[PDB]
Each structure stands twice: as C-alpha cells, then as structure tokens.
Amino acid sequence: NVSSGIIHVSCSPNNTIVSASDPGGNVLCWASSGTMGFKGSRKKTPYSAGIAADKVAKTVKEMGMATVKLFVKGTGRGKDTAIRSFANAGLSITEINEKTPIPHNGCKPPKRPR
Amino acid sequence: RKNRAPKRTVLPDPVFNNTLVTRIINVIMEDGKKGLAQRILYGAFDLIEQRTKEKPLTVFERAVGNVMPRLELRVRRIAGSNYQVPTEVPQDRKIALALRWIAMFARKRHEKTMLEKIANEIIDASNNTGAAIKKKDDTHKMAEANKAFAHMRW
Amino acid sequence: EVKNDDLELALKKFKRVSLEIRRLAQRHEYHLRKGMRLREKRKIAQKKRRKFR
Amino acid sequence: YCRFCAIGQLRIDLIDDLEALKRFLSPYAKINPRRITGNCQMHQRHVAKALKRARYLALVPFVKD
RNA sequence: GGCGAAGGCGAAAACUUAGGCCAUUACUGACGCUUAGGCUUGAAAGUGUGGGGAGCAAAUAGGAUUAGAUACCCUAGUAGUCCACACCGUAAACGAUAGAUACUAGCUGUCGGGGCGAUCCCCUCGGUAGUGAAGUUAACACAUUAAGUAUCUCGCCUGGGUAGUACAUUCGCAAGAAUGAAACUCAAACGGAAUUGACGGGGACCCGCACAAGUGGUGGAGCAUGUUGCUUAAUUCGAC
C-alpha cells in the first residue's frame, strides 16, 4: 500500500490536528485529540497530541506507511512529540517541511490574551 | 533549604531477623511500647502460618516487591489551581510504602480475633490481589494522566 | 524555513530553530503596535548580539 | 571580511555573479546581515539589493529552502 | 545604519527631481542670523468621500469566575482595517536640553568620501555612540555630537488647587484646535535630586517539621477547666 505520502500536522494553540493525505488528493486517516475522547481542556496538553500522533502513526503503519512528507504547523514540543511518536511507532521521517504561516503584516487574529 | 536525610529504622527483630518485621512493628505501632506488642506479633506469626500456610517472610517479601510504587507527583501551580508532573522514586520509598500499606490494612478488618484479621490481611495481600496492589495500579494509571503536561516547560 | 542536515539528527539542529521560531512567532499570534514591534525587535537583536560577543 | 566591490571590477550587474553571492546567503535563502556577511555597509547594501533583486527575479527563493 | 523639517522613509524594478558633503589651489566678494507678518507639513484618530474592505474590532450579544466584570479568558459584531480627494491636528510630536556658529581633556570608535595601500589596516572631512579628566547642577549626567564658555535671532515662566476655564476673536459642518482668564480658597505643590530602614501579591539568596514523606492525631464524643453570651445582688477584677 502506501509507503511514502503526505501528512499535515497542525499543532493548534490548544490541540494538534494530524491527518495523512495522499498527493493525488485522497486521505488515509484523521485523528484529533477529541476523536479519542479527550476534548475540552486536555487537548492542549502535549501528551494528548502525542497520543493522537501515536494513533495516526499506528493506523497508517497498519496501512504500511514507513516514511511521509510532513507539513507541520504550530510551534512547541507538541510538534516535536508528534514526530517523536511517529518515529517510535515506525513512521519514519525524511525532513521537516516549513511553509509556515509567517505573514508580512497580513491578517489580524483575535486580540492578545491579556 | 533541607537536603537529603538518612532513612533510619531500628535493627532487625531477633524473632524473625530482618529490619522489615521491625519496621512493621514500628508502623503498625500504636503509641509505641514494646512491652506487649511483641507477644502479639509472635501470635500474629502463628496465625499467619496456621491460616492458609504461608511463611511470613516469603509472602511479605513478595507482596512488598509487587506492591512497590514507582511514580510520584511534583507540584507546579498556575495560581488558580494545582496540577502534578510525574517523577521516579527509588526502592526505599517503594518498600516503605508497601510495609505501610500492609501494616495499615492489617489492623483494620472485621472478624472475631484481631490475630485472625491480621493473618487474613497477610493472606489476601499474598497473591497480589487488591489490598495494596490497587495503589500500584492506581499510581501507574493516574500518573500517565499527569504526563499530559509532562512535555510542557513553564 | 526548511532546515535538515541529517537522516535523524535534523531535529537536534532544529531545536534551536524551534526556539527561534517561538520567539519570532509569538508576534504573529497576536497584533501589537508597530512602534513597539520595531522597538522590541531591535532591542532583542542588540541584546542577543551583545551576549554573543 | 569584505564581500562586495572586491569580488568584482567595480562594475555591478547580476549576470554570472550570483554564484559568488551565494555563500553570502545562508542555506535558508535568507540575506545574511552585515553581522554575518561582515562587509562594509556600502558593500552590505550592495549584497542586500542584489539578493533582493534576485529574489524578485526568481534567482533565489524568498523564504523557500 | 543612513535619507528628510521634527512628523516619516525598508520585496524588486522604471518614471521627475532632490538637499547635502569630499578635493574645489576655482569664483561674485559679508550677499552672514532673524521673528509678530504669511504659510504649509504633521504619526494617530474622527468625519464625508468612490469603490474596495481578507482579517479582526471602539460600542454591543453571550459563555464563565466574580463582590458585579459594560475590564481581564473566548467567539461573532458596527465604523474603521487602502489609495485619490477635503476638514481635522494633537502626541513620551523629548536630547524631556531652540535654529546657526567660536573653540575647548582623552580613548575606542561607526559609516560615507579622499589619501595610502593585494585585500586589509591607518589617517583625514562630515554624520556618528559609549567610556571618562576638569567645570557645573540636586544628581542623573552633559561631558568636545556640553548641561564649559558664549555669540545674533526667535518662543516661554513668574507659589499653588484653580483652569487652558469662561469670554472677545481666528480656523474648523462639528468635535475640537488657536488665544485666554477671573472669582473662591490653602500655605504649600501627590513640588525634583539624594539618605534611611521598611514595604512588595519586584529579583537571586541562605537555613529553620518552615515546607514536604510521616507518627499520632485535635476540634467530632463523655467528662473536666479557662474565656465569651445572658442573668442575678454579685458570679470580684482583668487579660483580650
């Protein structure tokens, strides 16, 4: 089956959305911190991100995926624990890809937590 | 700021010749005085071997070894509440907590003779069914929940 | 952006880059005044170069 | 040291010289400051304008590695 | 680091033009500074404006703790989020130190030009900071880019809360901007510098069952004793 594809890891400010996608367009699996029953205040915990990464890695390794192109967004140890759990679960990596949202004074997010 | 201290315990009781039974004397102890408690402990040994034959040394060592807790929870607060982060413990805390649990559940049961209930507590702590192994299961199943914030530095 | 010189150790080189991304991306998560933006950027740059030498 | 107005004959262009300007740019496709390049401010701004012109010419990616 | 009056100016390229500086051994030959006149500019912000308007937001709606949250956490939300056009015009618009100039310790400088010279380094003309002698101030510091010494010219302040307040009058549809008090009242200004310990829900810091891992636990209960509440004529008094 699949042995090399694309995975898009979105380390949300309080979650981490991991979904394996094919370059042709289809996707393989998707698991959120809530899809496992840990939604509302535990998704922000990095171990929830690690467990979601473990889930997607194990299901896509049952699909046979050894390595994958990884477009990770969101900064912190969540984006590191995700790839750590990927490597531990047999889902190796080739490199980190950064097309990260670095706007040149672009849009405006909601106001700062004060 | 207090640093590490020694973990002192009175030398072995010459009736069974290990510091473990002496620590049991000291922690099952009520208002410590070794005038009468040693004869009652001899009787306790007797009721241990009489009920469902088990040499106290072997059963106690197996129970202590299996009940050994590994996880402890450090504290870091956000000024609104407090959470826990797991760390590791040495074998000294393991054995101290195991002896503590065996002694505390030895004194508190419900059957005619107190000798009988302490013997029965030893018997039910023998096969590592929940009398104190529940603590070992609970610490492992709850510190893994405190791994939630383990990968966060603040 | 894309930093990788190894098969597995690229994350070792990427830890410092991730700290740098933290300190250059806490500005994109919320909007703040432009004058203070330039002030903090230049002040942090001068502080970092001061500690380097 | 000095990275511009010394690797050429004072005649400035962008043809067949970006290969000499590459090592003045980190593999991040980022313009190395005067702090990193080490050239004079005149030559540092030479390097900066040439590299930004090359970026607008698709000779070197803006933020892509 | 630089350009421009301060305001502002940074993805590249082209369009019209810029001031200023180096060498000017060159040239008219004091033509040098000057404000009340007379102006424009001026971050932002608000208004209209023609469209645009991703994005989020002044008010607002809610969900939560709360002493309530019209603040703070979270999402929607109106003007606004750009240029072309007009009003608007204040700002930590400050070097909190007016424009220009005569020099004056020192060191390293930083860039542009010139000289030199493989580069480079060094020196010099300007912008260009720290260090620091003396002097001064209350000190910070200014310190050769002065706050040392001054020079031409301009604007400002004459104990205060009052009050940039009313008004004459100017600009502006307006808001406001410009100018600008008086009356009452006090004996000083939340008057600046700096000392002292102190404070902190500012910073590191050391030990102390202070904390923690404990033993046994108290207040729970029966009975005592003190005290408090009553009440007496007093439950002597007090402590707190």
Q: Are A18 and A58 in contact (CB under 8 A)?
A: no
Chain-centroid distance, C-alpha D28: 13
Measured between CA atoms, the residue of chain A closest to residue C15 is: A80
Residues of chain A in contact with residue C31, where contact means CB-CB under 8 angstroms, are 108-109, 111-112
- Between CA D33 and CA A110 the distance in angstroms is 33
B55 vs C41: CA distance, rounded Å? 73
Report CB contact under 8 Å: D65, C49: no
Answer for B70: CB within 7 Å of strand E.
no
Using an 8 Å CB-CB cutoff, list chain D residues near C1. 28, 63-65
Whether any strand E atom is under 7 angstroms from the Cβ of A40: the reply reads no
Q: Is the CB of D36 under 7 A from strand E?
A: no
Which nucleotide has the shortest C1'-to-CA distance from B93? E213
For strands A27-31 and A17-21, give the pairing: antiparallel
Calculate the CA A1 to chain-centre distance. Answer: 21
Which residue in A53, A44, A54, A59 sits closest to A12, CA to CA?
A44
CB B73 within 8 A of CB B146: yes
- 3-class DSSP state of B87: strand
- List the single residue in D with minimal CA-CA distance to A103: D63
- Subunit contact C49:D35, Cβ cutoff 8 A: yes
Start-end of H helices in B28-146: 37-50, 56-67, 91-106, 114-126, 133-146
B69 alpha carbon, distance to own chain's centre: 9
Question: How close A63 gets to chain C, by Cα (Å)?
Answer: 23
Contacts of A107 (CB under 8 A, 6+ apart): none
Mark the nucleotides of strand E covered by protein, meaning any atom under 7 Å from a CB: 1, 11-13, 54-58, 72-76, 81, 110-113, 119-120, 206-211, 213-217
- C50 lies within 8 A of chain D by CB: no
CB A70 within 8 A of CB A79: no
CATH of segment(s) B19-151: 1.10.455.10
In chain A, the residue whose alpha carbon lies closest to the alpha carbon of B147 is A47
DSSP string, A14-79: T--EEEEE-TTS-EEEEE-TTTTT--SSSTTSHHHHHHHHHHHHHHHHHTT--EEEEEEES-STHH
DSSP A112: P
Resolution (A): 9.9
Nearest to A57 by CA among A113, A2, A114, A102: A2
DSSP-derived pairing of the beta strands B82-88 and A4-10: unpaired
Phi-psi map region of B101: left, alpha, beta (phi>0 left; psi -120 to 50 alpha): alpha
Chains touching A (3+ CB pairs < 8 Å): B, C, D
Whole-angstrom Cα distance, residue C44 to residue C46? Answer: 5
Residue ranges of chain B whose CB lies within 8 Å of a chain A CB: 147-153
What type of residue sits at position A42? Answer: R
Nearest CA in chain C to D64: C1
Hey, CA dihedral for B41, B47, B49, B54, is it positive or negative?
A: negative
What is the separation of C-alpha C39 from the centre of its chain, rounded to a whole number of angstroms? 15
The H-or-E segment that residue D31 falls in is strand D30-31
> Residue with structure tokens 């899809």?
A35
Taking the CA atoms of residue A83, residue A84, residue A85 and residue A89 in that order, the dihedral angle to the nearest 10 degrees is: 100
- Pairing outcome for strands D30-31 and D25-26: antiparallel
Alpha carbons C20 and C23: distance in angstroms, whole number: 5
Q: Where are the domains of chain D?
A: 1-65
Contact between chains at B148 and A78 (C-beta distance less than 8 A): no
D30 touches strand E (CB under 7 A): no
Residue B143 CA neighbour count, 13 Å, CB half: 18
Q: Residue B132 has which token pair?
A: 């104190």
Q: Do D65 and C2 touch (CB under 8 A)?
A: yes
Amino acid at B9: T
Domain ranges of chain B: 19-151
Minimal CA–CA distance to B21: which of B86, B118, B138, B148?
A: B118
- Assess whether B135 (CB) lies less than 7 A from strand E: no
Per the CB < 8 A criterion, the answer to whether C2 and A97 are in contact is yes
Nucleotide nearest to A112 (CA to C1'): E73
